[PDB]
Design an enzyme around this catalytic site. Structure first.
Site, PDB file in Angstrom:
ATOM      1  CG  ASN A  42      31.923  73.934  67.985  1.00 24.68           C
ATOM      2  OD1 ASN A  42      33.079  73.894  68.403  1.00 24.68           O
ATOM      3  ND2 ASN A  42      31.524  74.800  67.064  1.00 24.68           N
ATOM      4  CD  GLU A 100      48.177  56.923  45.381  1.00 24.02           C
ATOM      5  OE1 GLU A 100      47.021  56.504  45.195  1.00 24.02           O
ATOM      6  OE2 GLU A 100      49.104  56.727  44.572  1.00 24.02           O
TER       7      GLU A 100
HETATM    8  N1  LIG Z   1      35.962  73.584  67.874  1.00 19.99           N
HETATM    9  C1  LIG Z   1      36.210  74.955  68.275  1.00 19.99           C
HETATM   10  N2  LIG Z   1      35.320  76.039  67.784  1.00 19.99           N
HETATM   11  C2  LIG Z   1      35.564  77.449  68.190  1.00 19.99           C
HETATM   12  C3  LIG Z   1      36.622  77.754  69.024  1.00 19.99           C
HETATM   13  N3  LIG Z   1      36.614  79.070  69.227  1.00 19.99           N
HETATM   14  C4  LIG Z   1      35.569  79.599  68.534  1.00 19.99           C
HETATM   15  N4  LIG Z   1      34.930  78.579  67.897  1.00 19.99           N
HETATM   16  C5  LIG Z   1      33.756  78.811  67.064  1.00 19.99           C
HETATM   17  O1  LIG Z   1      34.172  79.565  65.699  1.00 19.99           O
HETATM   18  C6  LIG Z   1      33.185  80.367  65.380  1.00 19.99           C
HETATM   19  C7  LIG Z   1      33.687  81.855  65.358  1.00 19.99           C
HETATM   20  O2  LIG Z   1      35.042  81.847  65.122  1.00 19.99           O
HETATM   21  P1  LIG Z   1      35.811  83.268  64.836  1.00 19.99           P
HETATM   22  O3  LIG Z   1      37.195  82.973  64.316  1.00 19.99           O
HETATM   23  O4  LIG Z   1      35.907  84.089  66.119  1.00 19.99           O
HETATM   24  O5  LIG Z   1      34.990  84.135  63.681  1.00 19.99           O
HETATM   25  P2  LIG Z   1      35.797  85.040  62.554  1.00 19.99           P
HETATM   26  O6  LIG Z   1      35.982  84.238  61.287  1.00 19.99           O
HETATM   27  O7  LIG Z   1      37.142  85.454  63.129  1.00 19.99           O
HETATM   28  O8  LIG Z   1      34.930  86.408  62.232  1.00 19.99           O
HETATM   29  P3  LIG Z   1      35.014  87.712  63.243  1.00 19.99           P
HETATM   30  O9  LIG Z   1      34.677  87.268  64.650  1.00 19.99           O
HETATM   31  O10 LIG Z   1      34.030  88.755  62.772  1.00 19.99           O
HETATM   32  O11 LIG Z   1      36.418  88.275  63.214  1.00 19.99           O
HETATM   33  C8  LIG Z   1      32.138  80.179  66.467  1.00 19.99           C
HETATM   34  O12 LIG Z   1      31.230  79.249  66.058  1.00 19.99           O
HETATM   35  C9  LIG Z   1      32.950  79.618  67.652  1.00 19.99           C
HETATM   36  O13 LIG Z   1      32.056  78.869  68.575  1.00 19.99           O
HETATM   37  C10 LIG Z   1      37.553  76.632  69.539  1.00 19.99           C
HETATM   38  O14 LIG Z   1      38.463  76.899  70.256  1.00 19.99           O
HETATM   39  N5  LIG Z   1      37.321  75.261  69.148  1.00 19.99           N
HETATM   40  N1  LIG Z   2      51.987  40.981  49.625  1.00 22.65           N
HETATM   41  C1  LIG Z   2      51.919  42.466  49.820  1.00 22.65           C
HETATM   42  N2  LIG Z   2      50.921  43.243  49.111  1.00 22.65           N
HETATM   43  C2  LIG Z   2      50.863  44.728  49.311  1.00 22.65           C
HETATM   44  C3  LIG Z   2      51.727  45.349  50.144  1.00 22.65           C
HETATM   45  N3  LIG Z   2      51.452  46.651  50.132  1.00 22.65           N
HETATM   46  C4  LIG Z   2      50.413  46.862  49.293  1.00 22.65           C
HETATM   47  N4  LIG Z   2      50.075  45.667  48.807  1.00 22.65           N
HETATM   48  C5  LIG Z   2      48.930  45.834  47.864  1.00 22.65           C
HETATM   49  O1  LIG Z   2      49.332  46.505  46.782  1.00 22.65           O
HETATM   50  C6  LIG Z   2      48.134  47.518  46.368  1.00 22.65           C
HETATM   51  C7  LIG Z   2      48.620  48.953  46.449  1.00 22.65           C
HETATM   52  O2  LIG Z   2      49.482  49.198  45.396  1.00 22.65           O
HETATM   53  P1  LIG Z   2      50.564  50.445  45.574  1.00 22.65           P
HETATM   54  O3  LIG Z   2      51.916  50.032  44.994  1.00 22.65           O
HETATM   55  O4  LIG Z   2      50.712  50.788  47.072  1.00 22.65           O
HETATM   56  O5  LIG Z   2      50.013  51.783  44.751  1.00 22.65           O
HETATM   57  P2  LIG Z   2      50.892  52.433  43.511  1.00 22.65           P
HETATM   58  O6  LIG Z   2      52.130  53.066  44.075  1.00 22.65           O
HETATM   59  O7  LIG Z   2      50.080  53.458  42.799  1.00 22.65           O
HETATM   60  O8  LIG Z   2      51.264  51.339  42.557  1.00 22.65           O
HETATM   61  C8  LIG Z   2      47.169  47.340  47.215  1.00 22.65           C
HETATM   62  O9  LIG Z   2      46.188  46.396  46.662  1.00 22.65           O
HETATM   63  C9  LIG Z   2      47.860  46.706  48.477  1.00 22.65           C
HETATM   64  O10 LIG Z   2      46.982  45.950  49.162  1.00 22.65           O
HETATM   65  C10 LIG Z   2      52.775  44.545  50.883  1.00 22.65           C
HETATM   66  O11 LIG Z   2      53.520  45.087  51.608  1.00 22.65           O
HETATM   67  N5  LIG Z   2      52.845  43.110  50.699  1.00 22.65           N
END
Ligand SMILES: Nc1nc2c(ncn2[C@@H]2O[C@H](COP(=O)(O)OP(=O)(O)OP(=O)(O)O)[C@@H](O)[C@H]2O)c(=O)[nH]1
Ligand SMILES: Nc1nc2c(ncn2[C@@H]2O[C@H](COP(=O)(O)OP(=O)(O)O)[C@@H](O)[C@H]2O)c(=O)[nH]1
Ligand SMILES: CC(=O)O[C@H]1C(=O)[C@@]2(C)[C@H]([C@H](OC(=O)c3ccccc3)[C@]3(O)C[C@H](OC(=O)[C@H](O)[C@@H](NC(=O)c4ccccc4)c4ccccc4)C(C)=C1C3(C)C)[C@]1(OC(C)=O)CO[C@@H]1C[C@@H]2O
Ligand SMILES: CC(=O)O[C@H]1C(=O)[C@@]2(C)[C@H]([C@H](OC(=O)c3ccccc3)[C@]3(O)C[C@H](OC(=O)[C@H](O)[C@@H](NC(=O)c4ccccc4)c4ccccc4)C(C)=C1C3(C)C)[C@]1(OC(C)=O)CO[C@@H]1C[C@@H]2O
Ligand SMILES: Nc1nc2c(ncn2[C@@H]2O[C@H](COP(=O)(O)OP(=O)(O)OP(=O)(O)O)[C@@H](O)[C@H]2O)c(=O)[nH]1
Ligand SMILES: Nc1nc2c(ncn2[C@@H]2O[C@H](COP(=O)(O)OP(=O)(O)O)[C@@H](O)[C@H]2O)c(=O)[nH]1
Ligand SMILES: [Mg+2]
Ligand SMILES: [Mg+2]
Lengths: 34, 428, 428, 428, 428
Positions: free
Chosen positions: E198, E246
């Site tokens: 946070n 991937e």
């Molecule tokens: N980034 C973010 N953190 C939140 C928010 N609301 C609560 N938190 C944090 O989450 C933690 C608690 O969350 P909860 O879900 O209420 O806890 P719990 O798991 O439900 O457990 P119980 O309260 O006993 O039911 C605290 O650290 C809060 O500060 C939010 O809206 N955004």
């Molecule tokens: N010339 C060209 N090279 C590419 C392109 N896209 C990916 N490459 C290269 O190809 C490699 C990725 O291979 P990819 O086919 O996406 O993964 P795979 O599906 O597991 O075989 C990487 O080194 C990319 O940089 C393209 O559009 N044009």
């Protein structure tokens, strides 16, 4: 064409790159037209 | 390609920064809202994704009041609020406050902006510092920066326009201390150091411009004109273009002697300009007049180790060759033996612009001069004297040792001001 | 056959070539489009010496434009004849030259040479019978001095048999448009002697005179001076390009002008030079063009021939005339002021002539001279080099690029040895 | 006869194959509807090499598209030239590849080969005289490497006498778009040495420089990279399709390039190549095309030819020309740089030539060289492999598919035994 | 095809889910009433028999007071009420009550909802847990649930976006207890586990967007943005599509080490977007900045065992190919020896979509960084400390032994953290 060959020599900025690519596209368009 | 980063520390630095960044946005047609209705501005701006042109400057201060003025001034639509930097408290004319205690928490921020402002450039000419020695932020903080700069780049050039504590007129009482402490820690870091003073430009406002009401805005206007002239070769065409690299090598003979003077001409209102033709010779004559200088230093007590003349407007290079010849022939102008040479002249086809509501006129010619004369060692002696005259009594010292300093740096910085001074006479 | 490849280093070299490639381009009747639009087949016969065939019947100049700080090359490209250059015939680096001959020849030179050599070789093979090289230097600046000589050394070790011309512009004895001028002057001279074959020396001062007195120009700009250098550079190769009852390759100029492999610094001048008014009174005769070419004013070098002794000389005429006149004229002058000439050479002149005149004129001339009077140039440079080296001023810059002090000593001695040579055969 | 069946493995191989079928569909002038709309008969005499007839006078490519995760196969079907493939020529499975060469070659590869083999057989039986296969790998990913090699060993034991190309895109030595990349490299190569006949290697890096310097492209998208690969892939089979005063079947390229059965890793480049500016000036001759092809930059795989000597090489022209020049050009190049070749091979280039140029151009070329330079590439990968395999990083994935560790050691021993072969015949 | 089952346990889990399922229905145009006016939403939806799109998620919780808000908020027409599971009583920040007493009776219910939901998906990529360690539900139940999952699937991948008990800011007093107990259980069950926090996100809203009133509704919008850029390739096109298989083979070198940091960029308001250009180099720089993380870890205290990037918007792959190289030059960032590879990249042509009423601004680029760095063993080490700091007093232990636990679990939960902390050192 003369503007495209006068704008050249070290395109450095993003606006320069954009304008030169725009010139490229205009050139392609008119080559298709003529 | 040819881009400079302009920094403005302290109050005076960001004061002239308002003038300079008024002139530039006027000279290039930049509107206060970022946008204008090729490379003509790249030196001073960064066109955004579309439309706006953001100035590549940095406003730094600890006093919140002034940076909050440009935040509400008409030129708030220009600067990215990442540029405007402020601070809760101020330095209050203590070196340690700007240097030892307060500076160290914010440098990591300012340097984080430069690394974000340097990488935007591919060709970085050199930094452009605007200091005001005699105070706490300007001297204390500014010195703390250059150290962080030179450890980072080193290879880059550091240029500085520092106003200097006048001998006679002094708004402070403690400025000899932090000024001396400034000079020590800046020397081994700054590559070149211009110097100016208000009192001289006050007279300059009196003799030529003929105004009996000089306020800080007028002085700041003139510094805008000078710097607008220097950078023309960086951002305009013209015969004999100059850049910073050329500028610094043929002007700093020895690593230490880099403290330099300045001058500008013509400096004329609207009327006397109508009764004038402005021959290139007249302009280059006044430019070498010791009264037209921006420092209360007399060059007629020393020898010009070098000079650099930047003209402007309508000039043809034979006239420069003609006028400089007429000067090298005179007798009042002295030079040191080992340089029969010593001139780096430049021209630009772009005339000087005038600011609406400003004080100067519309002229087709303009000349600025920057000389490194060994006669500059004199004003460095007055401050050499005021320190000891007060350091004996150890007055005001409790502040410094009370803010994380000691007596050593009083001694340390003292000798270098003697070590520098003897060097200013070894060249004789 | 007899193709010529051309180089342009430095700012000025990038600038005079803009004219040289503008004058020639109109002589052979081609347009800034690159298309030929002249009248005679003669423009087409020996066109291949300065140009290359292009698609659609276009001609591009066989030129190379090298300069750090590409800001200037934008100008020529925006110039009226900037559309003819191959954009791949442009090499540049963003960093400024700095005129530190080292970085121009040690650090920043080294970065671009590999690129330049790729460009020269790219068009060296474009020649069936490559005649030789020719450059456009500037000894004061660091681009031409540093890189050009660095390139020259690279050319010579890969084209030893071909001949390296040099249209170097020499620093002035009176005016100094920079400060470190004598340094880079010598360090280039220490490289020219061993890796050059014919090296003209021309200076803006005498260029200002020729423009001031004779042509009656009110405002000589840089174009006009470059307009002059364009004319001479165009006159030199009129034999390689046009018919002639006594043609003259460059290599036959070489052997007929340098008796010793080290006395290879020349001195030039153009003829006729008349204002508009005198042109309607003067009459075009062979006697006119030869006394004017023989006067001690047309010498664009800042040296007085009356103080030295012509070892050899030469004249190139263009325009339909009678070859007996030119034969006896050079015999008359060789008799009259027989004190300005040497004895151990019976006849020390070569009178070439062309059948094709200039474009708008009908007659013209051009003088070359290898007189020992030029040893005054190198003596003046010596006193400026030794004085500052006696003090080691501005020197940390040069050692700042790995250089030492021996290179300054040797370069001094080599020029000292050189001026001594020009004294032996100068028996007064 | 001489028909060729085409396979497209992996994502990239599926994506570059989209362009390859878009270029050749335009070379022979057929429309995205599969209908022919060219003009000559040369578009038809050898159309049967790339296509199969269809009802209504339509042509569909003899292509196979194999890949897990059928997501990407929808893209190529969405593009402009997707509608020409038989939707039966689509093999896919829902599960992704995971970059795990094992599952691509042990578990999930084993589940589709029984299907793919049913498809490759169905059009290997559609050829009157099938010349050979050709695939498009990507040695980084799991599909291209894993499934690709598995398919290959299947074909080789079923069509032994035929020839198997491989247009594999190798990993990069500097940049690394996956993490397990060295594992997918070495494990694939250990299958290619024994189960291939000609295996070109191609990298993205060198293809970025080629797109940046020469073409002056700002933003090379993958289309443009795939665009160049399409050009080369077409250039190999100009002789199989179009006439030629000296034709070159693939079976004769292998015997002219592979003195030893294991040295079948090639290096390719395309010519001419230029921007839109320089295209206005460059002239198309055999000299241009042979100097640009023999350059060390056009080698699309990231290796320096200079650090090796070309065992053999080959060049494929297409366009009307004079066959004498191509005979002597490769005779000069073999004579100047006599260090860049071997001695036990008297003449180590083949000069094919075709009679029909590309669509819009008039002349073109294609370079192929079995140089000992490539040994650097395998040197690099054999380090990254032995780096992590020394720490057994990521190895738990591969042991998750019944693989062992010997399989790695045997694969590594295979590459060293290979790079040792490139050194024997590299006698410095 | 490519679909994910998104679970939300605890309150923070379903809180964030109220934002993710906000961005998704906006990203794909789905109105709040289930229907818009393929493969673009099937990954996150299931088109009904006619019209409506139900979100393929599960909102699970024991506290009825928050699930009943979605049951009455504007987002009830989306959710079929059978999804939203509730419970009469909560865990009340006790791990045992969440894991041993209450959670044991509702898993079989939710396990049926997943079973009723996994069947509708043809190709299941993987689950997507949103745990919130630091409560009783998120820790006790989530841990109990993942046991019930791996015994069914095992081979299938279980992700996780688990917020973590912050070092400084903590809103509970026993969360050192449950957090330890959760990891001891999830570790051998999950296979990848994102961590975030946070206060690290509080600062981001203060540093970057400069909102002085961050609220749990603000943080949730950022967690929403992180996932959209992650799952883009799962539901969009673009170069280098990345899938969960991937995504994890190349990110978890050893079975134990799978905790990883996170990041995102650009993170700026509306105005700071108009003074910027946001190059691909800017975003990839801020992404690697330790200040832009969402965990309170110092990456510069360790190296990167692996990393990954998921770009977005308009990007060309060369700058990524280039910008990653620039980062591989800096010395601040480290990498372990056995990993010379290590940048799994990814592009998507679909920009990031801004939610109205949101704090971010519209941009054309975005980078989500995910990195498994060995520096994370410090936030792991804090909880190693506070646990033994209290368990020495046996404080709060009476609850745990009273709710179906004993001391055995505490001791066994302790050793595993120690054994895992040596593991983060065995990699050095
Ligand atoms: N980034 C973010 N953190 C939140 C928010 N609301 C609560 N938190 C944090 O989450 C933690 C608690 O969350 P909860 O879900 O209420 O806890 P719990 O798991 O439900 O457990 P119980 O309260 O006993 O039911 C605290 O650290 C809060 O500060 C939010 O809206 N955004
Ligand atoms: N010339 C060209 N090279 C590419 C392109 N896209 C990916 N490459 C290269 O190809 C490699 C990725 O291979 P990819 O086919 O996406 O993964 P795979 O599906 O597991 O075989 C990487 O080194 C990319 O940089 C393209 O559009 N044009
Ligand atoms: C109507 C007429 O005859 O006018 C002349 C003219 O009066 C004079 C004054 C011309 C004129 O030259 C100048 O005005 C001038 C100005 C500054 C520096 C140098 C010259 C002329 O411009 C020059 C021009 O000369 C040429 O055309 C030459 O062939 C010359 N060409 C150029 O310089 C040129 C280049 C590009 C575009 C236009 C002209 C040349 C020189 C060397 C090698 C090849 C060609 C001509 C005959 C004239 C004018 C127009 C007045 C003169 O120059 C030349 C080179 O001939 C200056 O003194 C000579 C004598 C001529 O009589
Ligand atoms: C008027 C003119 O000459 O324009 C050219 C052109 O200027 C240049 C720059 C073209 C042009 O290509 C490019 O600009 C380009 C950009 C990225 C990647 C690749 C190419 C051209 O597009 C390429 C195009 O060439 C072809 O059409 C070839 O036959 C080529 N075609 C294709 O690859 C293709 C396929 C599908 C759709 C469109 C084109 C080819 C190559 C191998 C085998 C068969 C065909 C033409 C003549 C041109 C343009 C239009 C500018 C060049 O390309 C080719 C392969 O010819 C780039 O280097 C060459 C040199 C050409 O001179
Ligand atoms: N030429 C000129 N000088 C100015 C201007 N504004 C202030 N100065 C001078 O700046 C000097 C004071 O410097 P400060 O900026 O107050 O000192 P500091 O280093 O910032 O330390 P603090 O005052 O604590 O913030 C005075 O001598 C002023 O005359 C201006 O606009 N033009
Ligand atoms: N004839 C002529 N000489 C010039 C011109 N411009 C500059 N010069 C000389 O060129 C010298 C500067 O050299 P320069 O090339 O600018 O510096 P470099 O880049 O370091 O080589 C100066 O001494 C000028 O006098 C011009 O336009 N015409
Ligand atoms: Mg102040
Ligand atoms: Mg709770």
């Amino acid at each position: 064409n003369t503007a495209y060959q006068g704008l050249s020599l070290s395109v450095d900025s993003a606006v320069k790159k954009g304008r030169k690519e725009a010139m490229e596209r205009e050139l392609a368009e008119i080559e298709r037209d003529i | 390609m040819r881009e400079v980063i302009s920094i403005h520390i302290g109050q005076a630095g960001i004061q002239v920064g308002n003038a300079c960044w008024e002139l530039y946005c006027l000279e290039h047609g930049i509107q206060p809202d970022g946008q204008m209705p090729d490379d003509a501005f790249n030196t001073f701006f960064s066109e955004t994704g579309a439309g706006k042109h953001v100035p590549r400057c940095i406003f730094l201060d600890l006093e919140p009041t002034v940076v909050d003025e440009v935040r509400t001034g008409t030129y708030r639509q220009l600067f990215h609020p990442e540029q405007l930097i402020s601070g809760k408290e101020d330095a209050a004319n203590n070196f340690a406050r700007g240097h030892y205690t307060i500076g160290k928490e914010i440098v990591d921020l300012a340097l984080d902006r430069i690394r974000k402002l340097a990488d935007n450039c591919t060709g970085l000419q050199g930094f452009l510092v605007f200091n005001a020695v005699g105070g706490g932020t300007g001297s204390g903080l500014g010195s703390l920066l250059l150290e962080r700069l030179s450890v980072d780049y080193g290879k880059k050039s550091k240029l500085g326009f520092t106003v200097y504590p006048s001998p006679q007129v002094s708004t402070a009482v403690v400025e000899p201390y932090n000024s001396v402490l400034s000079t020590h820690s800046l020397l081994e870091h700054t590559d070149v150091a211009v110097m100016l003073d208000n009192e001289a430009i006050y007279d300059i406002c009196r003799r030529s411009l003929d105004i009996e009401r000089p306020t800080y805005t007028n002085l700041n206007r003139l510094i805008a004109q000078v710097i607008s002239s220097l950078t023309a070769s960086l951002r305009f065409d013209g015969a004999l273009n100059v850049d910073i690299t050329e500028f610094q090598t043929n002007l700093v003979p020895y690593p230490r002697i880099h403290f330099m003077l300045s001058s500008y001409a013509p400096i004329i209102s609207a009327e006397k300009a109508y009764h004038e033709q402005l021959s290139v010779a007249e302009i280059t004559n006044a430019a070498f007049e010791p009264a037209s200088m921006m420092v209360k230093c007399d060059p007629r007590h020393g020898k010009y180790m070098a000079c650099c003349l930047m003209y402007r407007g309508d000039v043809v290079p034979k006239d420069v060759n003609a006028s400089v010849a007429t000067i090298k022939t005179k007798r009042t102008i002295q030079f040191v033996d080992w340089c029969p040479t010593g001139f780096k002249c430049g021209i630009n086809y772009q005339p000087p612009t005038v600011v609406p509501g400003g004080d100067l006129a519309k002229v087709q010619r303009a000349v600025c001069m920057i000389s490194n004369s060994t006669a500059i060692g004199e004003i460095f002696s007055r401050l050499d004297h005021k320190f000891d005259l007060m350091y004996a009594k150890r007055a005001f010292v409790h502040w410094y040792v009370g803010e994380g300093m000691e007596e050593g740096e009083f001694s340390e910085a003292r000798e270098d001001l003697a070590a520098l001074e003897k060097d200013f006479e070894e060249v004789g | 056959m007899r193709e010529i490849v051309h180089i342009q280093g430095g700012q000025c070299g990038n600038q005079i070539g803009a004219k040289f490639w503008e004058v020639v381009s109109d002589e052979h009747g081609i347009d800034p489009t690159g298309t030929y639009h002249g009248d005679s087949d003669l423009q087409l016969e020996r066109i291949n010496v300065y140009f290359n065939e292009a698609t659609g019947g276009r001609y591009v100049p066989r030129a190379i434009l090298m300069d750090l700080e590409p800001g200037t090359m934008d100008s020529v490209r925006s110039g009226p004849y900037g559309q003819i250059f191959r954009p791949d015939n442009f090499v540049f680096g963003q960093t400024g030259a700095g005129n530190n001959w080292a970085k121009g020849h040690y650090t920043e030179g080294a970065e671009l040479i590999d690129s330049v050599l790729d460009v020269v070789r790219k068009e060296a093979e474009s020649c069936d019978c490559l005649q030789g090289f020719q450059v456009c230097h500037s000894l004061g600046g660091g681009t031409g001095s540093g890189m050009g000589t660095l390139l020259i050394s690279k050319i010579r070790e890969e084209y030893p048999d071909r001949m390296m011309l040099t249209f170097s512009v020499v620093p002035s004895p009176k005016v100094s448009d920079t400060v470190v001028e004598p340094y880079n002057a010598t360090l280039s001279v220490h490289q020219l002697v061993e890796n050059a074959d014919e090296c003209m020396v021309l200076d803006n001062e005498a260029l200002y005179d020729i423009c001031f007195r004779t042509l009656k120009l009110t405002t000589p700009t840089f174009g006009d001076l470059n307009h002059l250098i364009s004319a001479v550079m165009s006159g030199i190769t009129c034999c390689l390009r046009f018919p002639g009852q006594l043609n003259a390759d460059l290599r036959k100029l070489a052997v007929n002008l340098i008796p010793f492999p080290r006395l290879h610094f020349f001195m030039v001048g153009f003829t006729p030079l008349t204002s508009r008014g005198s042109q309607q009174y003067r009459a075009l005769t062979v006697p006119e063009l030869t006394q004017q070419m023989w006067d001690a004013k047309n010498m664009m070098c800042a040296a007085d021939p009356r103080h030295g002794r012509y070892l050899t000389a030469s004249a190139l005429f263009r325009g339909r005339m009678s070859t007996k006149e030119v034969d006896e004229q050079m015999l008359n002058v060789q008799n009259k002021n027989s004190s300005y000439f040497v004895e151990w050479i019976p006849n020390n002149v070569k009178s070439s002539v062309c059948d094709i005149p200039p474009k708008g004129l009908k007659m013209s001339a051009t003088f070359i001279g290898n007189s020992t009077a030029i040893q005054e140039m190198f003596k003046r440079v010596s006193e400026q080099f030794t004085a500052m080296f006696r003090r080691k001023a501005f020197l940390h810059w040069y050692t700042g690029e790995g250089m030492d002090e021996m290179e300054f000593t040797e370069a001094e001695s080599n020029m000292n040895d050189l001026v001594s040579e020009y004294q032996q055969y100068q028996d007064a």
